[model samples]
Target: MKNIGWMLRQRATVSPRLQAYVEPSTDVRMTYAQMNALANRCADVLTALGIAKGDRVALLMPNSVEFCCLFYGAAKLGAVAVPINTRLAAPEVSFILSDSGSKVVIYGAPSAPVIDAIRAQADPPGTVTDWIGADSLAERLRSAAADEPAVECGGDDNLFIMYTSGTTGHPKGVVHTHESVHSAASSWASTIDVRYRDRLLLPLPMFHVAALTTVIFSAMRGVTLISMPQFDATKVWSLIVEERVCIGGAVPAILNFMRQVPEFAELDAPDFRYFITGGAPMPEALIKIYAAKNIEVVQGYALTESCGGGTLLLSEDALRKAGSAGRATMFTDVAVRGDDGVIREHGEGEVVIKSDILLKEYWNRPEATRDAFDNGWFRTGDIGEIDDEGYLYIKD
Candidate 1:
């Protein structure tokens, strides 16, 4: 029955007195109590600014406590948060703001100018109603109410609007509801064996689906989330060593950087459990290198539409299975389908999924939704084969 806002509420309950987050970039950290206060304040402020249920608020902030507060705050008020990639150009940013019909934009110090530039070129009819900067609004937020208001929300309540970067062209906004969000977060936690005592080193951009979803996973499970504003190989290793980060998440690009570093050859962090890589097919060679360091590499195939991960490469049998994206998560169903619109029997064609973790829809794109589904199943774009042993492998 809990929506995305319930993730924040759970963190407040379990880690009530513990340090829930630490932002090394800004040298700031907050306990669960403080996080709850700030999120409440943010919700109060947005609600007072005319933000109502189902309204969309755009966030163009960098990785910081403010970014997390804004997301959870918007959710608490039953508003959908639209997180914009700060790395994008001005026009790219403008397109998202206008396309999503975001009423307000919350930006960070680094992205302030970029958001401002986009605001300037925004059409008269589509301009965002309010632009608030993290640095400038901190004082104002402190004065806002700290008490959370009661808002009725369901599992199907829209959580956020995440735009997927298409392999060929312009991105499409994938809408995830509260149920899908909770399913993805819970499934990941159970699949990865994440616990309250575990600390995850997060070096990826918060705007990215991986980072955003991981944050939700940690929040829901009350795990400590340690993040860096940007990716720095040396800094990441240092933080892993310093904070005893159990499992780190990254893309193949990050693994490539780590493998190529000469210093990394001699380095070792036994405390580090392993790393999770997605966003692309993780090359097999890189997986072997991490094994040498006693650290495993977990890869999966998922889109923003899947909430983050649909399949998790199981650690116990990962090497034995070799190249497979493993099986679907506990609450998810994955099967191959033929062109005849019938589910293929132990064969390969396209990977179709039916899961509580599936997205509500592509926001406002009904035609796209109709095209994406085959019957009640989501026609996952990737073509994959199911072996006789029932393990599914993506066809190259």
Candidate 2:
């Protein structure tokens, strides 16, 4: 039924010893079989805690191997995993917990104080019932059986809930089903031409939709994912050279900072092929600078609701479409809607998208979900248009 948990199992069976993820910061590496085993153990832990199918499990941890294990573990048993941003304030964390109705909130050592504060709050108390540390959970998993859960779930079941950055108001929980998650990974991998031999360097926070989808794409394509908890320009450069990373994803801000590095010009990165930049506009100068060094910086556009699948400017079109978000992805349909809700070809209007990768809904926010859609297409608030050649240009 295309369950994400089942996908992991299939990969493990096909290539048990294939390296799935690596952490350069800690020198930790895990194979597909090992990762699946860890996920199984994590599922056991959740089951022991009275977490049933369709229940919510919140995670407040840094980008680490354990975080990945816990994420897949929740999916293994049809439980919804809610990963919170590590940088969020105490009250903000409390709100997500209360709003999500998470049964258990897992925290790392660094987030203990913030979680403690949430536990101490009196008014509008948090709904989270169980609080466990990441390390403790790992220890529990060590003794648990490395066997898949007995629960049965389909691709339509909820897999995870990612809360968006509520610029206008409180963060809304974006729910993605198992089918949509797989569609996102497969579509993104196909659009980027990701290969099994490629190694992906992801320095962005995993809590972000882009980074999470990149990780899934790497796994789906059997590519190795090298993660760095925090972004450091120098560290990233070293990893690129040392790990022979072929593809990477970064924001425009990080790309800008990398160009400012003292030794950036002298860096040797023959193995590095290209980078996917998003979150902001990619300056033409920056793209030119990278191209001179035989590297490509392709700009793309997406949102948490889309599960990170949208439009991408191909490497060959980097210069030709310097300011464009490029063409719509293979499995996604992008169109502009005018004020009268009529789809337009050239004129600027709200950009709307229809894709299987789109989120199921905003968890428990029916009115918000209703307002987000026009007919069957999801309304993207940004203004953009498609040219005659089918390339998308974001004006807003």
Candidate 3:
């Protein structure tokens, strides 16, 4: 309940036969105990780099066991883990690296040049003196001292410094504390009906909140996670057939690709039960496509400020309530409000929300924070209408 670390501690009680992660390249599989030990070693490595509570450590890598370890390691010391988008161009990456004041950066071999370019421009040169390559990660972890300081973090302590997608404006760093994370994990796990038997296929960048929250949810619930470095429609289809993945999250574009694929006609997905889409609206066409395939496609609406998901569309209701963004999650209060500042009764207006899952605040941006909240509710910039049935639909 304190933060993510508390949820992580719960994994130790899970059955030993269940695996936490599988690496196809190494043909390696690990249980909860093995993964936790590696993650603790990663924490020791982070602490050895002089990273203490509240410091920002940036990760510029793809999805892998290394990424998961570093993320949890930073949490162990109350350090904010900043994940830089691997798809961003050099200049964009440079801006985030300098702006976040990140003290250390870890990149895969393919991302080495990008990391070097940013490190060169970082203020107070040598800010990223500690750099580790993916190939040598195991060696470094082995040599790292297994000693960790007894650090205490509160529910309000910042855990991650996540940047917006930058699709509309300059990316803003949204700071999330431990309490926000706990709320998100709880809401997500319950809504999706996740269990230790579920296997999560995460194909998006670890930097995105969608991917981050799913990984955290799987970790907290003792579920197995199969990660892909990036989303490939062909690979996703093959994985579903091969790994028999039960649940995962994707954006609208990814869903469209899967539903539109020609090979989808021949594939049988009897084991695939549920999949959720977010980051953009799910067009009705794509929605019907998945429904016809017997794959439950749930659409959601959320922001970095909300920690992760605020709305959830379940399998039973996805088709019945066609274009709606489903219903608000159990822990959130969502409504449409007019410009006059009162909640709108039955028409379109701004989509606003207030929940335990909301972030602590935008990092060091007081004026922005003041502008974001109205009374107590956070005014989501999205324009939408809540129908008489209470299902919210977005308007362009």
Candidate 4:
């Protein structure tokens, strides 16, 4: 019964005047009400172009307001938003476009040249009917109706078709429903220390499932999301200092990149809260390094399949349980599944997760979906071991 659009409408109604999102690099800022209105227009524009329920809309852009508008807009219209990795090559992009069968292709100005090549490509997917540039779409949204789209989108309704860079072969399209995404975000909200009205510096790529879930969680918690179009370690710290950012999320590499900042040695931001790292195991040494400056560095473990809900190393265990991704989040259960197909309480083995946060299925890949789960538990490729005290450790 839970829909992402419903949450957007609810948040807009409750915190209409609160600053909802800001992309400082793009000079874009909008309150909760404004964000909702933009999303409505995005839905309206798509409707005018014949986009409807179950249709796919491909997005090729870096961080931008229009990207968000189209995302929430597609959710409202019950259409699936397919976010293409901005770093992908033209062939990879074409593969996803064909695989997802995206109807409308929207891209930033920089990607227009690729659109040209795609159009000129003799064997490109014929399913795409419209190639909308970001500038043109921006103009369209200005006069488009701000009223909500009439649609029945919730629960099992598909919301996104996020592609994963297949380590073994071609990219795989992962499908997630509105309910699954909402459930994941709700669990993340409870696990993280984010607060209402706090400025959050989430420079993580929005095209990724982890950041996408964070985007929804930020709206649900009423935090001012501060996104950067690109990563600049110095600028990240400056945002934390100038904007008084309360909380943020990043991977270990970015944290290491931030150390390159010339002012990092003297960096002192009292309002800045701890940053949660995931996607890789954090070095215990890195945790202690940050702690020296009163900045806490925590760890989390999640995958694209779970919508980023797995385990979190919280502030309480910041230093005490360094190198641990802590425990399974609320509404999620994690255990080690042996190669022999048995669940055990101890020892390192393939990690498995039991949570509603898991993806609905791999888009159009039934065999892959069936193989992704052992019995009912989602099979995580990660190697994990749980301690007697209940901390989850990811082993290479």
How close is every model to the real structure, measured as TM-score?
A: 0.94, 0.96, 0.92, 0.96
Task: List clashing residue pairs in candidate 2.
Answer: none
lDDT of 4: 0.85
In candidate 1, where is summed lDDT lowest over 10 consecutive residues?
118-127
- List residue ranges in candidate 4 displaced over 4 A: none
Maximum-lDDT candidate:
4
What tens digits encode model 2's per-residue C-alpha lDDT throughout 1-396?
877777777878877888888887888888988988988988899888878889899889889877887878888899998889999899888888888889999998999999888887565435666899866786787788888887788598998899985686788999999888899998888887678858889888878878777767676778888888767777788888888889888888888788788768688888898888887768788888888888887778888999988888888887777688888777988888898878765666888988999999999899999989887789888888788888888877
CA-lDDT, candidates in order: 0.80, 0.84, 0.76, 0.85
Worst 10 residues of 2 by lDDT: 120-129
- Model 2 off-target regions past 4 Å? 124-126
Task: Assess candidate 2 and give its lDDT.
Answer: 0.84
What lDDT, from 0 to 1, does candidate 1 have?
0.80
Please give, for residues 235-349, the per-residue lDDT of candidate 4 as tens digits.
Answer: 7888788777888788888887777678787888999868878877677777777777778766778888999888887777876776787887888888899888898767678
RMSD of 2: 1.5
| Stretch of 10 with least lDDT, candidate 3 | 119-128
By TM-score, how accurate is candidate 2?
A: 0.96
Decide which is better by lDDT, 1 or 2: 2
Clashes of each: 0, 0, 0, 0
Candidate 3 regions off by >4 Å? 25-28, 121-129, 145-149, 165-169, 260-262, 344-346
CA lDDT, candidate 4, residue 147: 96
